[PDB]
């Protein structure tokens, strides 16, 4: 709401400035305001939105992992009772992380996904939906954990189905979707074999399509292919 008085173009301009200044919280707030203008986002604008929130939530995830590790050690036998503070602060960071994920999911649901008809936009947003449900799953422990995991899976699966029908195997969005869905299988769904199979098949099918690409497209696709290979090396 606080961006309601700022022009759409000004919000986009300031998001780019915020990125240059490494002010990712500001960047995300500007892009949220841009989305809330109600118009569809161009390719560049979609990537500004994703970069901003990925940086914000990435920092929260890193902090949550540090605090969770300290909390785990505090609860091993022989450790000294140091009070509720570690749990409280881990919970504070966790709640803020969940709030960011809920905000992103809310933008996707109101109304980016429903207006996205082209494969490049729709797959991009469904990948985001899977990613932010995955981040919620990383911290989930309650009655709803299985439903959170299934929400991530469902969004990734719809994105996968569209990407395989509508994009070449080297399309970087298709590749990044596969990379992340493979990580979902390995880290969230306790399915390392599915993770490895998906990464391998994605890599091999992309390899076979590189011959169709310009030098610049080749650079983009091979960059993500190397991430798939990096994960395969980690996992095998």
């Amino acid at each position: 709401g606080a961006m309601g008085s700022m022009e759409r173009a000004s919000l986009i301009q300031k998001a780019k400035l915020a990125e240059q200044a490494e002010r990712y919280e500001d960047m995300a707030a500007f892009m949220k305001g841009a989305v809330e203008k109600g118009e569809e986002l161009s390719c560049e604008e979609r990537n500004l939105l994703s970069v901003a929130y990925k940086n914000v939530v990435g920092g929260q995830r890193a902090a949550w992992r540090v605090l969770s590790s300290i909390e785990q050690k505090s609860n091993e036998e022989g450790s000294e009772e140091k009070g509720p503070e570690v749990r409280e602060y881990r919970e504070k960071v966790e709640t803020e992380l969940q709030g960011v994920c809920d905000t992103v999911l809310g933008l996707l649901d109101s109304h980016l996904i429903k207006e996205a008809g082209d494969a490049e936009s729709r797959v991009f947003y469904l990948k985001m939906k899977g990613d932010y449900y995955r981040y919620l799953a990383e911290v989930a422990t309650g009655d709803d954990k299985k439903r959170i995991i299934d929400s991530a899976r469902s969004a990734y699966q719809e994105a996968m189905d569209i990407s395989k029908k509508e994009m070449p195997p080297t399309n970087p969005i298709r590749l990044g979707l596969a990379l992340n869905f493979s990580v979902f299988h390995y880290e969230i769904a306790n399915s390392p074999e599915e993770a490895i199979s998906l990464a391998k098949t994605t890599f091999d099918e992309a390899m076979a399509d590189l011959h169709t690409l310009s030098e610049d497209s080749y650079k983009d696709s091979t960059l993500i292919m190397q991430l798939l290979r990096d994960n395969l090396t980690l996992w095998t």
Partner: peptide
């Protein structure tokens, strides 16, 4: 951790 984009 593994790579994601």
């Amino acid at each position: 951790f593994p790579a994601t984009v």
